[PDB]
C-alpha cells in the first residue's frame with residue numbers, strides 16, 4: 432500500500448485527463464477516416480492514370496524527413512572511420528576537383544583514401560557540410576545540412592545503425608521513438624576494390640538513407656554493389672512496431688545503358704505505380720523493359736536530369752513525376768528487409784547495343800528507404816484511433 436496508492440492516484444489523474452480529451456480525439460479520428468475513405472475511392476477509379484498506385488491504400492507511416500535524428504553505429508567486424516581520415520580521402524584523387532570548389536561529391540570519392548593505417552574509432556564521428564564546412568555543399572542535399580558516419584565493410588560484414596531523437600515520424604498517428612537498421616554488404620557483390628572494402632556513408636537523417644561505394648577512381652565492367660537493409664521501428668514505449676501494410680518508397684531506381692539500380696530480397700508486397708519504368712521481375716524491382724535515363728533512348732519517356740524539356744529531371748525528391756523511377760513496397764511485421772544495389776546491365780539482361788552495353792560503371796549508389804511514396808495523392812493517416820480510457824482500480 433506504499434506507492435500502490437500513489438500510482439493509482441497518478442493513473443486516476445491521467446484517466447481523468449484522457450476521458451476529458453477522448454471525445455475530441457474520436458471526432459478527429461472519425462473525420463480523418465471519412466476523408467481518407469473518399470480519397471481512396473477516387474484513387475481506385477484513377478488506379479491506371481499516370482503516377483497512381485495500381486493497388487491504392489493509405490499511408491500509415493509518416494516518414495518524410497528527420498533532419499535532427501541522432502546516429503549511433505556499431506559493427507563487430509567492421510571499422511568505423513575517423514572524420515579526419517574521411518576528410519583527407521575527399522581532398523585527394525577523383526573527388527579533389529569538387530573538394531576544391533567546396534563541394535563534397537560523394538559519387539566521386541575514391542574510397543582507397545579511407546584505407547589508412549590509424550583510421551579506426553570506437554564511436555561515430557559525423558562528417559559532412561558542417562563545422563568548418565557549414566558553408567560547403569554536397570551533391571546529395573545541395574545547401575541543406577547533411578552528415579554521415581563512415582564505415583568500412585567487407586562482404587558479409589554488417590553495421591547496426593540506431594537513429595533516436597526523431598521529431599516528425601509517426602505510425603498510425605503514434606510517435607516513433609527509435610529506428611534500427613542493420614546494413615550488410617551482400618556477399619555476391621562483384622566490385623573489384625582489392626582490399627574487399629565498401630564504404631558506407633550512413634546519413635544522420637535516416638530518410639536520406641545510405642551512400643554505398645566501392646569506387647576506386649576507375650569504372651568497372653561486370654561490377655555490382657548490394658547492401659542488405661534490415662530494419663525495425665520502435666514505439667513510444669520502446670517496443671517494436673508490428674506494421675500493417677505501411678508503405679515503403681523505393682525511389683531513384685536508375686537504369687542507363689550500362690547500369691541498373693535495383694531492389695531485391697525484400698519482405699512484403701511490391702505495388703507497381705501506373706506509368707512507371709519500375710516493375711518486379713523474378714523477385715527484383717527495377718526498370719524491367721526500358722531505360723529511364725534520357726528521353727527517346729532505350730524506350731525512356733523522360734530524362735532523369737533537368738535539361739529544359741517537359742517532365743525532365745524526374746529524379747529528385749520534389750519532382751512531380753519522380754514516380755517514373757519509383758515503386759512501393761507494402762510491409763508488415765516487426766522485422767523487415769530489402770536489398771538495394773547497382774549492377775552492370777550485362778549481368779542482368781542479355782547484351783545489347785542499346786539496352787545493355789559492356790561499358791564500365793562506378794560501383795556506388797545512393798539509396799533511401801522512407802515513407803515519401805512518389806505516387807500521386809496517397810492519403811496519410813495522421814490521427815490515432817483513440818483507446819477508450821479505462822478507470823484504474825484501487826489497491
Ligand SMILES: [Mg+2]
Pocket residue numbers: 682683684685692797
Ligand atoms: Mg538512383
